[PDB]
Design a protein around this nucleic acid. Structure first.
Ligand SMILES: [Mg+2]
Ligand SMILES: [Mg+2]
Ligand SMILES: [Mg+2]
Ligand SMILES: [Mg+2]
Ligand SMILES: [Mg+2]
Ligand SMILES: [Mg+2]
Ligand SMILES: [Mg+2]
Ligand SMILES: [Mg+2]
Ligand SMILES: [Mg+2]
Ligand SMILES: [Mg+2]
Ligand SMILES: [Mg+2]
Length: 74
RNA sequence: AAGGGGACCAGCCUAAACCGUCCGGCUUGUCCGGGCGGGGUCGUGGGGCCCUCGGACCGAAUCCCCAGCCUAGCCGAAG
């Protein structure tokens, strides 16, 4: 069963990553302890749109700060 | 059972794509979810979206009215 990790877990996976686990592990351990969520089609959109938004708010630093390396250095 | 002969006869509404709005979750937006409205309903496949040209008839199974009918009756030939 596929889940989306909310936290990095040793010898499991990294935060925001999709991993395969047995249904019982997800249902009786990971999910109740807030450590993951089901890789449902709803959640995969929400994860996507966060990975997307972080890359957006990153590039617009490396560009409006890059605009500063234009004024300075000249 | 098909098929044939007859009785009767009638076909519709949604879900999803997409659009709009309200509400709330936190994991902050191009988010996810819930409600309502729009859109849509099909097998010659149909629908959505985007271009392109083109602009009255239908009509309920709902509602209103009225014939008709039912729940009492009446007239009715000639020793
Ligand atoms: Mg027949
Ligand atoms: Mg008959
Ligand atoms: Mg018929
Ligand atoms: Mg809100
Ligand atoms: Mg939804
Ligand atoms: Mg929504
Ligand atoms: Mg909605
Ligand atoms: Mg088609
Ligand atoms: Mg009808
Ligand atoms: Mg009499
Ligand atoms: Mg008499």
């Amino acid at each position: 069963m596929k889940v989306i990790l909310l936290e990095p877990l040793e010898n499991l996976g990294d935060v925001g990553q999709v991993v395969d686990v047995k249904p019982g592990y997800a249902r009786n351990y990971l999910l109740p302890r807030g450590l993951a969520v089901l890789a449902t089609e709803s959640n995969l959109k929400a994860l996507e749109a966060r990975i997307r938004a972080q890359a957006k708010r990153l590039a617009e630093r490396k560009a409006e700060a890059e605009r500063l390396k234009e004024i300075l250095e000249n």
